Each structure stands twice: as structure tokens, then as C-alpha cells.
């Protein structure tokens, strides 16, 4: 039994190292300790001091340097006895304060223990190194075991959730939270790996097909940002489906919010979608030739950033994992060849240079780029040319050929690009989903893997939607841990005095999504379908509704184009440039008409299927991105309320993507805004189990 043997892989990599006889003299000490601040400017930096004496209401302690401080017993962060260092579940701690909790994570982390229970939920501190705790060997260890008999792990939270689907005849969910780069996606993978092995078998084909559905998606929707080298630029809900017996019947992936703008623009040091790089690096010299390929350096979509690679990942190498993934999934070779044609053409569309012509409208002098794109897409180059610079609209009912300038022609090209890619994404997913939903499920476990909370020097509409989602997820923790918990108690009259935990990101949610009084998104919406509206008339309007009126909003004194929202995880400054176009998300109809006549079997499904090419009207208008997303979100929150939720809080150790560097400042922020200590306080003080 490997749980009980001190030499095993399980004991070596998931359990606290046996302390020696020196650490024993110290564990049995009668001395008592306190966590204090050496500089009261820096609240998150802690040193340890011995309590030397005590009055009625206060302790005196030794600082490290020399002196002796006095503070009130009520403002004292006491150090737990050292028998607690490395405890597996922090609800067991005698003292529940900030440095006390951080310290325990510090102890565990220093010997590579990334998982800690914080009562009912799991905490996962990111290692930024490979640690051998996800082998089949390790999966088997966790098969069936109750939570308090095995070490903390993601596999375990996964087992308990599974036991709970079978023992309550009720649907389950794993909500993995975290700012960008904190480890969400990695732990998501692990939930699926574990679920797959434990409840799998036709042969064992479905199982391999679900696992191999994530490298595809990752190639097309992950990219290098300044925060994460493998950042998910789309959100993911995965229902792993189970039969009446409790074996794997299927899986369905729902995606949210592809950052389509990445395809045509990256910030310094960042990358476009991995796929672009994988194609250019990993293709045969024959495949490069029929696609008119070159290196990344000769494409506008791939050479603006200064960076074409990521340290320790070979793009040549990832192209194989990806191709192998579309194989196992049952994408035909006609289908892949088209997929890389769509990807190849986007790059070419990117190389079209537009210049000023005789008058105010645009001409295209060199048609190398245009012709290449038309060639790989299966479309008439002269129809594309005209649809790009001279698209036709209605003026009243009259048909008017417009002649677009350099700025507007470029945007339209970009708009065509973003729609090609976005529709391509939607199609990969519906295809994957079709191979995998093969059975009417009796039960599911749902894994939520969102784009995590992010801030950049320049934060835009995408960031707002990313951060709004991260905010709703946080309130969803708040509702389950604190609001639902206590409204029971008080209803079962079993004698509870109400606690205000002081965690409520409601006023932030409402500022963004409220409809009456109107929130940011509704003011955006109203502005998008008002015809004299500009980015200037939009921010004035936002300032007008919220400056000095909502305690969650700021009009900055320093800029006339940014607004601040104070999120649970910090204040974010949003740039308004381009919001109206990002919300309307317009595409010229002549462009749509150019691509419906594609000789390509895939491109034609992106443009002719109502599934993928349609837009739901709203009276005299199309649905905005904000209203479409606010709704898909609400639709998911409704799916979650109907489940028993399990939470995993992923924690980023630092902001430099480094191993063995736990930055206290960075980790405590996250502990506060996540409500980690409030979650532990609710479990000590209260009564979870109720029959
Ligand atoms: O990526 C996109 C997605 Cl992912 C979706 Cl759902 C739609 Cl409706 C569109 C899109 N891109 C579009 C363009 Cl360029 C035009 C229209 Cl009318 C709809 C879309
Ligand atoms: Mg992710």
C-alpha cells in the first residue's frame, strides 16, 4: 500500500518530508511567536519575532534586528505552533491570519507541494516547473479514496466530485479560478485526464478522443501574452458526460469569447495564435509551396511584435501533436488541408498593402498578397479586390458603391480576417463536439476553464469581458460559500448570528451589466445603434452616468479616453478606442458574398452555414457582442446553479513566470481578493453537513 510506505513516489512527491531530530527540539519548545511587519509601509512582508512577555491586552516581541515592539492582542498575527507547518488542510490552524496562511503555503511550496485544502475547496499554487505527480500510478492511488485519507491533489477533488455524482444522483461542477497564468488550464487538463482514466473503458476510443480535443483547441485559441506563454484567449466549459451506470458516455465543449483581435494585432513581445507559428515551422517544403509560405518575419500578422518563439517549446514539434490530434479526432485530410488553407490565407490577407490613389479613396498597387489569398481560399481575386475597397451598401434603398480610404480598407480586411478565424474556431468546436456527443447523457461533471483576470498597459473591450467574467465567477464563490450557506442556517432556525464577511462584488457586476439604471455594457449597446456616435460620445456618456456617482467607477484626471473599474482583483484602466466597432462587429456583405462562392469545402461551410455565418437580429439591428456575451454568460451561470460546485483556486507565485520564487506581495493579493481566509473562517465557525 503506497499511501503507507515512506519510500514510494506518492510519499516522496505529495507528502511533507520527515523532520529530523533538530526540528523535534524546536517543535516541542514552549516559546511562542508572532508574525509582524518590519516596515509598516510594506504590510505584506513578514518577519518572525519571539513573544517575550504579555500584558492584559498586549504582547511584547523580539524583532530580528534587535528592538522590542508592543501591539494589542486584537491586532496580533500569532504564529501557529510549528507542528502545523505544512498541514494539509488549513482549516486545522489554531490561528487564522494572513501571514499564518501564507506561511503554510510557503512551507508546502518550498518542497514542491502545490496543493493545499483550505476547508472545502482546493488551493493550487503554480510551480512553473514540471513535477511528477500526474502519472497513471498517481491516478490509481486516488481511485475511490475519501478526501482526509489521501494527500491534497487535483485528482482528489476530482474523485470527490465523481463520488458525489453517483451518491446523490446529481450533476457536478469544477470551477477553477485564477488570474492569467495561475494554472487553470493545466489543472483543467488534469480533471479530464483523471475523469477519463477512472470512468473509462468500441474499445477505449472515446477516452482518447476527449483528451486529444484539447491540443487542437489550444493550437487555435492559445497565444503568448506578457502574462502567460500559453494563455487561453477563449473560455471553455467542458461537460464530461456519464451513463446511468456511471461510465463515460461523452463530452461537450462550449467556447466563449475568442479574442479575435489577436489575429491582426499583438502587443510588444507577444504572439499570434500558436497555430500560425506551428504551420510555418512544421510543414513540408512541398506544403509551403502550394500555400506560398515563408518565415514569420515576412507576414504583417506575425512580425510586428519582436517575438516569433517561446523559450523551450518547438513550433515544428507542436505541429505534429496538433496534426496527430486532428487524426485521432477524425478530421479527414481534405479537411486539414483546408484548415491550413484558411490559416495560410489569413496570413496573406495580412500582407495586402493599401495605398492612397488619385483621389480620397484607396487603390492596391502590388497584388501579390491579394492573389495568393484568393488562390488558397478558392475565390475570385477581382471580386475580393472590389469587396475590400469598393464594397456596396444601401443608402435608403438605393445601391451605393463606396470607395474606402486606406484606414477603412485595412479595417475591412481585418474584419474579414477576424471573421474567417472566429468562424473557423466555431467550426473546429462544433466538429469536435459532434464526434464526442454520441450518447444521451444521464449525468455530467462540468469543467469551467476561463480566461483569467488580466491587466496590461493597454486594456480594451476584450479585457473588460475577461474581467467581468472573472468577477462573476468570484461572486459565484461568494454566493455558495457565504450567502447560500447562511440563508440555510437562518431558515433552519438552528441559532446562527449572521456574519458580514465583507466580500461582495455585486456593485462591480451591476456597473458593468445592470440594465436599469443602465450599466457600462447597456450604454455601449445604446451607443452602437445610435448613428452619429463616436468613441468620444461614448466615453462622455460613461463619465456622465458614473463619474462621482458609482463608488466603483473612476473618471481619470490624467486622460480623456480611459475609465477605471475597481474589480475584486484591483482597479483596471480601460481604453475606449475602438469599442463601437468591436461591439457592432461589422463585416461588409460584399465580402460575405465573395466567400460564399468558394471552391473550398470548408470555407463554404463558414460562410453558408446558418450555424456559423448567421447573426440573430434585434428589431431593426443585429445583436451586439456585449449582449450576446452577457447572455451566454447568464446561460452558463444558470447551468451552474443546477450543479453542486467544487472550487479550485489557482495561485500565481510571482509575475515573472519563474519556479522556486514565491513573492509574498503577489500571493497575499490573491488570497485577499479570492476570499481564501473567509472561506476557511466559514468552515471552522459553521456547520457544512445538513440532513
Ligand atoms: O467571430 C465571429 C463569431 Cl465567433 C460569431 Cl458568433 C459571429 Cl456572429 C461573427 C464573428 N465574426 C463576424 C463577422 Cl466579421 C460578421 C458577422 Cl455579421 C458575425 C460575425
Ligand atoms: Mg487558461
3-state helix/strand/coil string of 269-337: CCCCEHHHHHHHHHCCHHHHHHHCCCCHHHCCCCCCCCCCCCCCCCHHHHHHHHHHHHHHHCCCHHHHH
- The span from the CA of 456 to the CA of 655, in Å, is 12
Q: Which ligand is nearest to the CA of 230?
A: 2
Q: Which atom of ligand 1 is nearest to the CA of 622?
A: 17
231 catalytic residue (yes or no): yes
Domain ranges of the chain: 1-31+80-454+586-615+643-691, 32-79, 455-585+616-642
Which residues does a chain break follow in the chain (C to N more than 2.5 Å)?
A: 201
Q: Which member of 118, 126, 173, 185 is catalytic?
A: 185
CA-based R_g, the chain, Å = 28
CATH tag for 32-79 (out of 2.30.110.10, 2.30.30.360, 3.30.460.80, 3.40.50.150): 2.30.30.360
Asked whether 128 and 229 are in contact (CB, 8 A), the reply is no
- Helix (H, G, I), strand (E, B), or coil: what is residue 122? strand
Ligand 1 atom at minimal distance to the Cα of residue 416: 14
487/503 Cα distance (integer angstroms): 16
Q: Which DSSP letter does residue 3 get?
A: G
Distance of CA 68 to CAs 42, 48, 62, 65, 446, Å?
19, 12, 5, 10, 54
Catalytic residue among 181, 235, 345, 422: 181
CB count within 10 Å of CB 593 equals 14
CA of 143 to the centre of ligand 1 (A): 44
**Which three cell numbers, joined as nine digits, stand for 374?**
484568393
Alpha carbon 349 to its chain centroid, in Å, reads 29
C-alpha cell at 682: 466559514
Given a contact cutoff of 8 angstroms between Cβ atoms, the answer to whether 422 and 260 are in contact is yes
Query: What is the β-pairing status of strands 644-651 and 172-177?
Result: parallel
Catalytic residue from among 126, 177, 228, 229: 228
Where is 33: in which H helix or E strand? strand 33-36
- Pocket test residue of 273, 419, 426, 588 for ligand 1, highest count of atoms within 8 A of CB: 419
Q: Is 180 a catalytic residue?
A: yes
Query: How many Å apart are CA 527 and CA 543, to the nearest integer?
Result: 14
Q: Which residues lie with the beta carbon below 6 Å from any ligand 1 atom?
A: 258, 260, 415, 418-419, 422-423, 426, 585, 587, 615
Instruction: Provide the 3-class DSSP secondary structure of residue 92.
Output: helix
DSSP element (H, E) containing 486? helix 484-491
Q: How far is the CA of 594 from the centre of ligand 1 (A)?
A: 16
Determine the Cα–Cα distance for residues 274 and 316; give it in Å rounded to an integer: 11
Catalytic residue among 116, 180, 459, 624: 180
Pick the CATH number of 455-585+616-642 from 1.10.10.10, 1.20.58.530, 2.130.10.10, 1.10.510.10: 1.20.58.530
Mutate which of 429, 585, 609 for ligand 1? The one with the most ligand atoms within 8 Å of its CB, which is 585
Of 234, 672, 125, 268, the residue nearest 466 (C-alpha): 234
Q: Which residues are CB-neighbours of 452 under 8 A, at least 6 positions away?
A: 177, 178, 179, 180, 181, 182, 184, 466, 470, 650
* Closest CA to ligand 1's atom 12: 419
Q: Which atom of ligand 1 is nearest to the CA of 615?
A: 8
Q: Which ligand is nearest to the CA of 186?
A: 2
Q: What cell numbers appear for 573 in the block?
A: 484602466
- For residue 396, what is the DSSP state? T
Amino acid at each position: 500500500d503506497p499511501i503507507h510506505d515512506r519510500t514510494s513516489d506518492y510519499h516522496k512527491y505529495l507528502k511533507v518530508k520527515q523532520g529530523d531530530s533538530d526540528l523535534f527540539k524546536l517543535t516541542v519548545s514552549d516559546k511562542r511567536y508572532i508574525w509582524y511587519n518590519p516596515d509598516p509601509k510594506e504590510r505584506d512582508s513578514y518577519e518572525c519575532g519571539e513573544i517575550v512577555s504579555e500584558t492584559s491586552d498586549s504582547f511584547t516581541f523580539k524583532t530580528v534586528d534587535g528592538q522590542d515592539r508592543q501591539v494589542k492582542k486584537d491586532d496580533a498575527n500569532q504564529r501557529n505552533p510549528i507542528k502545523f507547518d505544512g498541514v494539509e488542510d488549513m482549516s486545522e490552524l489554531s490561528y487564522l491570519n494572513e501571514p499564518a496562511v501564507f506561511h503554510n503555503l510557503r512551507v508546502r511550496y518550498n518542497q514542491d507541494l502545490i496543493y493545499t485544502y483550505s476547508g472545502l475547496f482546493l488551493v493550487a499554487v503554480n510551480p512553473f516547473k514540471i513535477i511528477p505527480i500526474y502519472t497513471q500510478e498517481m491516478v490509481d492511488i486516488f481511485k475511490g479514496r475519501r478526501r482526509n485519507e489521501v494527500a491534497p491533489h487535483i485528482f482528489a477533488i476530482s474523485d470527490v466530485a465523481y463520488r458525489s455524482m453517483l451518491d446523490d444522483r446529481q450533476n457536478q461542477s469544477l470551477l477553477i479560478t485564477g488570474e492569467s497564468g495561475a494554472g487553470k488550464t493545466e489543472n483543467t487538463k488534469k480533471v479530464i485526464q483523471y475523469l477519463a482514466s477512472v470512468a473509462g473503458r468500441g474499445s477505449g476510443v472515446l477516452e482518447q478522443q476527449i483528451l486529444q480535443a484539447n491540443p487542437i483547441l489550444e493550437a487555435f485559441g492559445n497565444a503568448k501574452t506578457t502574462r502567460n506563454n500559453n494563455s487561453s484567449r477563449f473560455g471553455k466549459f467542458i461537460e464530461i458526460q456519464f451513463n446511468s451506470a456511471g461510465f463515460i458516455s461523452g463530452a461537450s465543449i462550449q467556447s466563449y469569447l475568442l479574442e479575435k483581435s489577436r489575429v491582426v494585432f499583438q502587443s510588444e513581445t507577444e504572439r499570434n495564435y500558436h497555430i500560425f507559428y506551428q504551420l510555418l515551422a512544421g510543414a513540408t517544403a512541398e506544403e509551403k509551396k502550394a500555400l506560398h509560405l515563408a518565415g514569420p518575419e515576412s507576414f504583417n500578422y506575425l512580425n510586428q511584435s519582436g517575438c516569433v518563439d517561446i523559450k523551450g517549446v518547438s513550433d515544428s514539434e507542436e505541429f505534429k501533436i496538433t496534426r496527430q490530434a486532428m487524426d485521432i479526432v477524425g478530421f479527414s485530410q481534405e479537411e486539414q488541408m483546408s484548415i491550413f488553407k484558411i490559416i495560410a490565407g489569413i496570413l496573406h490577407l495580412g500582407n495586402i498593402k493599401f495605398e492612397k490613389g488619385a483621389g480620397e479613396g484607396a487603390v492596391l498597387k502590388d497584388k501579390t498578397a491579394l492573389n495568393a489569398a484568393s488562390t488558397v481560399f478558392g475565390v475570385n481575386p477581382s471580386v475580393l479586390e472590389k469587396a475590400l475597397m469598393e464594397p456596396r451598401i444601401l443608402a435608403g434603398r438605393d445601391l451605393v458603391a463606396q470607395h474606402l480610404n486606406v484606414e477603412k480598407s485595412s479595417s475591412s480586411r481585418d474584419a474579414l480576417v477576424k471573421a474567417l478565424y472566429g468562424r473557423l474556431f466555431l467550426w473546429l468546436v462544433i466538429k469536435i463536439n459532434n464526434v464526442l456527443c454520441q450518447e444521451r447523457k444521464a449525468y455530467f461533471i462540468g469543467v469551467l476553464d476561463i480566461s483569467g483576470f488580466e491587466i496590461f498597459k493597454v486594456n480594451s473591450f476584450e479585457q473588460l469581458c475577461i474581467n467581468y467574467t472573472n468577477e462573476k465567477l468570484q461572486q459565484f464563490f461568494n454566493h455558495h460559500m457565504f450567502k447560500l450557506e447562511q440563508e440555510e442556517y437562518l431558515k433552519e432556525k438552528i441559532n446562527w448570528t449572521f456574519i458580514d464577511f465583507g466580500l461582495d462584488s455585486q456593485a462591480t457586476i451591476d456597473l458593468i451589466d445592470g440594465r436599469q439604471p443602465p450599466g457600462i455594457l447597456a450604454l455601449l449597446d445604446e451607443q452602437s445603434v445610435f448613428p452619429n456616435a463616436t468613441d468620444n460620445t461614448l466615453i462622455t456618456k460613461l463619465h456622465s452616468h458614473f463619474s462621482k456617482k458609482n463608488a466603483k467607477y473612476e473618471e481619470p484626471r490624467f486622460s480623456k479616453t480611459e475609465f477605471g473599474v475597481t474589480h475584486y482583483a484591483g482597479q483596471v484602466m480601460y481604453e475606449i478606442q475602438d469599442w463601437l466597432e468591436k461591439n457592432k462587429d461589422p463585416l461588409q456583405q460584399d465580402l460575405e458574398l465573395c466567400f460564399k462562392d468558394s471552391s473550398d469545402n470548408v470555407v463554404t461551410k463558414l460562410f453558408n452555414d446558418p450555424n456559423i455565418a448567421s447573426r440573430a437580429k434585434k428589431g431593426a439591428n443585429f445583436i451586439t457582442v456585449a449582449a450576446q456575451y452577457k447572455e451566454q454568460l447568464a446561460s452558463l451561470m444558470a447551468t451552474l446553479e443546477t450543479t453542486n460546485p467544487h472550487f479550485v483556486r489557482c495561485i500565481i507565485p510571482n509575475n515573472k513566470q519563474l519556479p522556486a520564487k514565491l513573492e509574498d506581495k503577489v500571493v497575499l493579493d490573491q488570497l485577499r481578493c479570492n476570499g481564501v481566509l473567509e472561506g476557511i473562517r466559514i468552515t471552522r465557525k459553521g456547520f457544512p453537513n445538513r440532513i
